[PDB]
Design a protein around this ligand. Structure first.
Ligand code: 908
Ligand code: MG
Ligand code: ZN
Length: 333
């Protein structure tokens, strides 16, 4: 794990993001990427500013330099894939910032927890190859075999956690080095728990757990906190449909392409290709986005908002508005 150079730090620090408010729910990462010929540095700068602007690293003894090293170490481990790249995790970081601070979810968590969530966003898809857990298992790839053998089906999530722990073990990039005892432990545990909860195989049960805790005035507090963290990283991870329509559409395109490439590699390898992943089948984003909205994102956001996260109402409003817009694309086709 090579250390970060002063030269690499400078390339981030020079980016100024004129005309961008990284704290805004309408912030546009795609327009930020286009704004320079160095989209990676700009994305790094966005994460840096989000973290410093929270006031949180300072409070837990994370210097400016260690924070930036950490960001750049994370960045080196994302690949050039259409969706699960560095821009996605910067997007999730930014989105989480909005849920905490514009949606007032910060009130439900300690400052450490807020800090951990922003950091965890940047590690939560480390080294993704554009292939989902299912691909590794169906193809009996080495990682799939290892996951089956060890009893943990969350092939990618365990891999992400491993690389996170790797980055944090170097003090130069240990954003948690200012912590000790129970706090350091809670930081690592909560980071790891959150990443493991982003496996969509566990979606229904994570949601049901959170909701049951939020309705229970005698829920154990520590447990409620943990679940709140998990639900917020999950929320960022499926937040593409809570964004302004053109931003939501660009995300859907990126993910769709990545799914299609997975289906291409499955074909070639003679394994089962699901309809969603199959180029030869679809010809329509609209129906896909509406289906994802109806079956996954709208019930999720409505339920967490109603249970507990009142300040995030806008998410439910934008889903509804985006869905109506996709219905217009159908109605006029
Ligand atoms: C912006 O849209 C999405 C946003 C997120 C996802 C995800 N969906 N899933 C599903 C298994 C639930 C993942 O696990 C991904 C990894 C972890 C978190 C959520 C991600 C999928 C879509 C999505 C992709 C394709 C379709 C679809 O039906 N497209 C087919 C087509 N139109 O060609 C629908 C939703
Ligand atoms: Mg993931
Ligand atoms: Zn993700």
């Amino acid at each position: 794990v090579t250390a970060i150079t002063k030269v690499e730090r400078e390339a981030v620090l020079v980016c100024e993001l004129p005309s961008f408010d990284v704290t805004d729910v309408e912030f546009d990462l795609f327009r930020a990427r286009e704004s320079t010929d160095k989209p990676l540095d700009v994305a790094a700068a966005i994460a840096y500013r989000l973290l410093l602007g929270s006031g949180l690293p300072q409070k837990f003894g994370c210097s400016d330099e260690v924070l930036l090293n950490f960001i750049l170490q994370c960045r080196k481990k994302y690949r050039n894939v259409p969706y699960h790249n560095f821009y996605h995790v910067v997007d999730v970081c930014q989105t989480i910032h909005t849920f905490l601070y514009r949606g007032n979810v910060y009130e439900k968590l300690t400052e450490l927890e807020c800090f951990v969530l922003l950091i965890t966003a940047l590690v939560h898809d480390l080294d993704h190859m554009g292939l989902n857990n299912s691909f590794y298992l169906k193809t009996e790839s080495p990682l799939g075999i290892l996951s089956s053998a060890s009893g943990n089906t969350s092939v990618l999530e365990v891999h992400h956690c491993n690389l996170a722990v790797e980055i944090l073990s170097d003090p130069e990039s240990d954003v948690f080095d200012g912590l000790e005892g129970a706090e350091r432990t809670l930081a690592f545990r909560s980071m790891i728990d959150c990443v493991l909860a982003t496996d969509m195989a566990k979606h229904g049960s994570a949601l049901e757990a959170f909701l049951a805790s939020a309705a229970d005035q005698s829920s154990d507090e520590a447990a409620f906190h943990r679940m709140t963290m998990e639900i917020i990283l999950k929320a960022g991870d499926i937040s593409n449909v809570t964004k302004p329509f053109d931003i939501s559409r660009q995300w859907a395109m990126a993910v769709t392409e990545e799914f299609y490439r997975q289906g291409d590699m499955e074909k070639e390898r003679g394994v089962e290709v699901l309809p969603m992943f199959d180029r030869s089948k679809n010809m329509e984003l609209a129906k896909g986005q509406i289906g994802f909205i109806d079956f996954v994102a709208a019930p999720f956001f409505q339920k967490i908002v109603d249970a507990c996260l009142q300040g995030m109402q806008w998410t439910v409003d934008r889903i509804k508005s985006n869905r109506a817009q996709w219905e217009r694309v159908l109605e006029t086709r």
